[PDB]
Each structure stands twice: as structure tokens, then as C-alpha cells.
Design a protein around this ligand. Sequence first.
Ligand SMILES: N#Cc1ccc(Nc2nc(N)nc(Oc3c(Cl)cccc3Cl)n2)cc1
Lengths: 427, 552
Amino acid sequence: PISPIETVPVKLKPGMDGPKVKQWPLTEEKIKALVEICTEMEKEGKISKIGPENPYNTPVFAIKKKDSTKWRKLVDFRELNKRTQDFWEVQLGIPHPAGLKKKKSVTVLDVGDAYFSVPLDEDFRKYTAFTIPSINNETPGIRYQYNVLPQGWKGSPAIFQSSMTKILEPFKKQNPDIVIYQYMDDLYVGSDLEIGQHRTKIEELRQHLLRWGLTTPDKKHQKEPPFLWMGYELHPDKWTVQPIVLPEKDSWTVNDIQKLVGKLNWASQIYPGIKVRQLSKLLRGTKALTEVIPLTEEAELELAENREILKEPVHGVYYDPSKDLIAEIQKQGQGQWTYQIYQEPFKNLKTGKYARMRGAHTNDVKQLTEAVQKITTESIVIWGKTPKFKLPIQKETWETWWTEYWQATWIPEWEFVNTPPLVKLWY
Amino acid sequence: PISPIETVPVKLKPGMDGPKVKQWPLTEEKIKALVEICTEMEKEGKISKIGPENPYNTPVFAIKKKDSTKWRKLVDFRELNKRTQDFWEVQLGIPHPAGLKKKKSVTVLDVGDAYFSVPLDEDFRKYTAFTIPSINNETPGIRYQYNVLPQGWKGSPAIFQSSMTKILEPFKKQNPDIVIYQYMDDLYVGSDLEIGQHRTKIEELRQHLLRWGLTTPDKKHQKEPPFLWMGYELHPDKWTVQPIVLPEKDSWTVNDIQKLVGKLNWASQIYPGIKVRQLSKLLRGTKALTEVIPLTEEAELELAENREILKEPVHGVYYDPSKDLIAEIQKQGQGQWTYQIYQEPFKNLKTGKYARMRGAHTNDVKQLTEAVQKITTESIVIWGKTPKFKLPIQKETWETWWTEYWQATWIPEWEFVNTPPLVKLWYQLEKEPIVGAETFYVDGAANRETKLGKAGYVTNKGRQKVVPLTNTTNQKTELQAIYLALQDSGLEVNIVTDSQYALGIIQAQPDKSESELVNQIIEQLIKKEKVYLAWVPAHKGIGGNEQVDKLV
Ligand SMILES: N#Cc1ccc(Nc2nc(N)nc(Oc3c(Cl)cccc3Cl)n2)cc1
């Protein structure tokens, strides 16, 4: 390539040294993939091999493109991101449209292919050093640093930003109603047209981009239907509140009410307006449990009254952009998974539920990863940012298999919880 | 002696600058000891007579420890180092033998004096300047600057391994059969030729290296296989641990109990079945280093059994990528699990253990999954793949538990291997209250300061009880209360508690826990036909738990 540009200086936040992160061991198979890839990347000049004077290191993985014939290198730039992109969240912040979630449809196309033209300020490369590993560590790792803006690094989108608006401008012109938002490596395009027009309005974009340089592999299929659904299509106006409803019942037993008193008592942390005494007093006894019992004075009052203060979202729940978004996911069993996304306990900015299919073809670890990526995309689409996940799965298992079904080009942050208590109940 | 190797550019940390430390005393004999060395060193080019111009300085010493014939120049770069940039790590993790591959002939070249052969980034030399004092008059001081890689310096091991790796690459290509692993002053070469031919290749490599200023000697001090390496004992087709030594003593002190346990884990890589639960239980008091600890009864028994094991020598085989990787685990019983990874029925590939140190409550199946995970991770590092498993658990169990468990899991390819002990759910709690069943409204509180509590129940049938307990905490009473109801209930029972603590613990469906209380309980759980537990908010909650708390 002939220098498309001539580099943008990049400086980490003061009192900050580049990344030095260990590089997880990997499946032989995956090493070979990386190996192959980097060999080309090295020819194409995207990456060069480095020496011992480069102490830095960001992790690298191999994932299945989108199940295509080959692997994809996924550099975990999370460490280098915090050490830069944050002050390039400012320095070059990419503004987030609060209407994208309102579109009748939002498509996601991979434009990460763009960057690989744009050389990277030289004094910075040294920090993108990533290492492909050796089995058993017999051989010293192979080492490379990035010669161009690299995918995954939130300073790549920002530097290309400028160049993107340019590419997109003569389209946002003839499509003033379609919103286009860029996050890291993806374009989120949203339109209120009947899908048919939309999808087309997209290939209309797919090609605008195309005839101006960029390439969006996003050619999911062709006329023949080997039952492989089309491009990433989200429908955010149907992004709506989930069910948190008590059980309506003919005959109520002592047990039933008991639980019902607990669910509510738990709820009292999200809704200070709920009450139970008149419902609980009905249990003050030490009666059996299989025994069915009736209402009380305002029992039916409290159950329905509450049943109301509970069918309208809570208030004071505002999105603080200063804070990070947090997300818990509890395993519901039988392929379902609930999730809250919040910034301060109980003030849920949003909840919901993911679910897979029936046994035979899916496991836990795949589901969760799928749920995580769906919650992340949702979050990106709604707030422009990904949330720190509170994953219910032994760290190590997760670390061992997350990559196994990862398709996202980004890595949300995450940690592991060893105790979802009553929550699975309430939700 | 020195080569046309390219130099790695170097740097001093951002703000810093060259070391200016002095040391000008003079042991006449030594001064001429160093001068001799430098003259034979500057002659060889490794150093240079420098001109008095800003050189910072570094300490020079003469050394000769035992069985003298010669001396040794020694410079102290502790201050230069504290000023030089950071370099790519070395061997972040030592390769495990269990994963090395079988060879016929293995040879080790001495690449010790090597680094002096490798060039030092011109520009950085200016700092390497030391100064050997001429005996007295406070003379100009015979002064030098390094041209190669100083023996002390920070970036030498790196810049070296770096350089050496490059020099080999070509050779390494044109000769894939040859494994070349270097380990500090060592560079091993292993192959599949027969000693004659093998030694051809060795020489070629030797000559090749010579063409790059790195020289090597033919024969000097030590022996060949077994190769004493990284606490291992390496053989051309087998591998094992360094002869380990379990000492016998009258009194053991923490430091002594530590070095003992450490050695045991180390011996576990290959010696099947070694245990350690007891001797470490002792070290659970992390203070002293010389506090003496009385080998309790079990610890001793254990240590012993570890001797019968180590009595017999044992060795491991290598990895053949054509065959399968299998892994088998067996429960030892105290939270101890063992495993051996092989491809072949008689000699092993590697062995190891998985104890449940973590906390004070856990199930036998989860533990099995924890061990299966530990091995999965280990295999990925060592063989680059997951082993197939063979385990004492039946799908019905497993598939059930992972279904009930609130955490996600992913246990791989596994074949059932019927052999005691066995892993199973010794009991399950009911999901719906039991009709007809007596309902025990359990409770028990304790006085936080007087350490005095109570545990009781009041049933639907009007039946009561309260048992005074001393020296316990709510949690203890909260459990004893559930244990009570179990003792006095019948085959079927419905128990209501106000304690999440208690509830959880029970529900975790623990196999055991040395907390004898929970044992008494778990075992009653086993003996019952159908139990049903129910949680119910404390304070404000039910009226039956109130009627027992007003009591306590
Ligand atoms: N004796 C002996 C002996 C020494 C080495 C091997 N086989 C072997 N295979 C591979 N792929 N890499 C290495 O590398 C090593 C060598 Cl050659 C020497 C010391 C440690 C290591 Cl990790 N060795 C087998 C037997």
C-alpha cells in the first residue's frame, strides 16, 4: 500500500506504562491458525517481528470468523485500551446517538478491515506487541508488533473516525433518516423501513463503502437457503421490559404464600413501596405446608395493590455516564438465562432473558457466551458502551472455553461470581 | 570470540542516566589479577580502553573461591541495571517433560562464555565503563568500556537468547529432526540419528555457531544422561524426578514441614497416589519459621504412606502425538483426588492431584468437575489439546447435577469407569413440600457475647422442643435446629428455617465437611426418605420463628 495517510501521535495517560499481559496457552490447532495468519500479516506489512527490547505484550486468540473456512485473530486489547482509549474517549471521542435504539432495525457490519491501510504512529507500535505461543513452551514465543491501526484497539476506530465520516457523508445525505454509529470495529446502521427496503438500504451501503475502499466480508449467504439466517439484525424498539409477575392462583397453600412473601420481601430492595405484613400475618401460624389457606382483610388488596406498584418501571433510575454499566446473568436452567444491567444495586437500567434451544445441540458454556455477546451488543446499541459482566461460572472453565464460541470482535470486561442466591427466584 | 551478530538497540529508563559508583581500594596482587584479565580481554576485543569522558562507573572485583588456578573479574552492575529498560521475559514457564518428545541421542553444548561473544548495542556501551585502579599514586586508573554482554547486566540473558535463537533458525530449518533447547549456560541438542551420525550434525551445528563468533568446547567436566535438569532427571525415552529425600526427624519446625510438603507435590508429577492433606493441615498456622509443630497422628500416617510410595522408583514416558491422550481420576477421600495422564496402559505420561483447599463446604461431583478442569488446563499447556477422560461418575449423576447447579459448566469427552470409590448424590432434597408430612418450624439463636444459644422447633402437630447449647454461634444453632428437627421427625419431613446460611449449606448438597455438626446432619439427610426445606425471611417473617426466638 502507498501511505494512505501519515500518522497520528499517540500518547498513553501519564503515569502509565504500556501493556505487559501474559498470553494464555492455546490449542495446538489455534497456534497453527495464528501462525498462518501472522505469516501473511507479516508479508502484507501489517505486522513486523520484534526484539527483546520490547517488553510489552497483549494477548491474542484464534476464533472462528463466523464459522467460515478459517480462523480469525482476536487481539484482547483490553489492557492497552484502558491505558489509552480512555484518554482517546476524550482526545477523539466517538459521539453516541441516543436514537439508534429507537430504529425499527439495526444492522451490524464489520468494518474492521478498513484500518489495515493506515500506518500507526511509530513511537507507539512497540505497545501493540502480542505473542503467538508455543506448545509446552518448548520454543520461545514468536513475537510481533503492529504496523497499522489494529482491530480491537479502541484508538483505531478513533483515528479512522475522521476518514469514516468522510466515507459515510455522501450517504447520510441521501439517507438523512438512517443513523450510523461506529463502535470499535463495527458499523451499526438503523432504519425504520420494512425490512426488505432496510436490508437493501444496507447492501446500498455495503456497496457505497465497497466502491470507496472498505470491504465488508458481510456476504452471509446467497440465493440458496441451506437454512443460514441473514446478517446481524437487531430490533431495539421491541427492546422491552421483561416479566416480573407473581403467580395468580385459585387455591393458595401455606408454602405458596411463603415463597410469595419472600419474592416480595426481596423485591422491597428495588421497590420500597411493597408491603407484606397483611400477606405475611397469614403465616404467623405454624400450620402445615400442604394446607391451603385463604386471604385476609386487605390480603387480596396487598397482592393486587403490590401487583400494581410492580407493573410499572421504577423511578430515579437514571443513566450516569460517569459510572460503568454492570451486568449480572443468572442461570435459569433448561436453556434460559436472565440478566440485569445496572450501575448501582437494584436500580436496574434494564433486564431481560436469553434462552437457547433444546438439549442435544447446546451446552451451558456456549449459551452464556452467547448471552454475554447479546447483552454486550444490546448495551453498545443503547449506551455506546459494553458492561462489566458478573459471570456465574468457574473462572478457569470460562477462561478455558470463552473463545470456543466467541464471535464478537470485542471483549467485554468480566469477573466470576460464586453465589447467585435468591435472585434466580425473583427474576 | 565475538561475532557479526546485529546488536539489539538498548536504553536506560526514561529519566535516568549512567551509573556513577566508585570503588578505588587496591589489592596489588588482584590489580595485576584484573589487568592480566583485561589485557587478555581487550586483546580479544570484549572490552576497550576508554577515554576519560563522562563515563559513569561500576565496581570491579577480583575473585577466586576454590581450587585456584585462575581468578575472575567481577563487575557489580546492580546500579546500571536499576537504570536499564525492561526486556522481553525469559522462560515465563518451564516446559514440562511429560510433554517433551522421545529421542535417540541427546547432547549438551556448553554455551557459557557465549554472551561475551555477542555484541553490545554500541550506544549503550558508554555506560558499561568500569575503572580498575592502578595500585596507589591515585593514577589515571586503567579504564574500560564493554563491547559485549557484561556478565552482570540486566539485558544480557535476553539479548543473548534472542541472538542465539536467530543464529539457530536457519540450521533449525534445514534440520527439523533436531530439537534444540538452551537453558542458560546450556544448549541441548537431541535427535534420531545413531550416535555416529548424530555427532556429525552436532559438529556441524558447532561449526555453524563458530561462524558466528560463539565458540564451544568439546569435553570439560560433567556427565551425560541422566541429565540433571530443573529438578528433573532426563532420559532419552523416560523421565523422572530428581532423587527426592524424605528426612526423618525427632522434631519438625514449620520451615521443615514446608520443605517437606513442597518436595511431595514435586514428587507427585509422576509418583501415583501421593497425598498431602494432613501435613499441610498442620502448616495452616502461617506465623513461625522455627515454631515447632508436633506431627499430629494423621500427618505421620500420611508421611509414612508417602515413603512406601517413594520407596519404589518410578519414571514416565514421553508424548507421541499419533496416539490418544487419556486421563483418569480417582477420589482419595479427604477432598483428595488423584489422576494420571497416559496414552499407554503401563508407564504413565504424568500424574498429579487435586485437593479442595478452598473453604469448608463442597460436593463430590463439583469437586470432580474441579479436578477435571485442572487437568484440562494442564493438558492445553502441555500437549496443546484436551485429554479424553475416564472417571468414576455415571451420566445420570452428572447430567442431573449440572442441570440442577446454578453455575455453568462444561465437562468434555468422558467415558464412565466403574471402580470404587464412586461419585453420586447420596440424597436429594424434594422440590415440593411433602403432603401429610410433619412440619417443623425450626429456629435457634445465640448470644453473641455470652456464647450461649438455643435450638428448637414447634410443629404443626403441636410438638415442641428447645435444647440449650453453650459455646456456639447463631450459624451453629441455626444448623443444630435443623439437625434437631431431623432427629425428631420421621422418614418424611418438612422443615422451615429462617437462615439463608443454613438453607444454602444444606442445598449445596455437600457430600461431607469435617464440621461434624453438618455431618450429623448430612447423614440424617441420607437416612431420611423425603426431606423438604424451606426458607422464610427472619425478623419480620413468620410467627413461628418468633415464638422460638422470644424463647432463646
Ligand atoms: N536425556 C534426554 C532427553 C532430552 C530431550 C528430549 N526431548 C525433547 N523434545 C523436545 N520437543 N524438546 C526438548 O527440549 C529440551 C531439551 Cl533438547 C533438553 C532439555 C529440556 C528441553 Cl524442554 N526435548 C528427550 C530426552
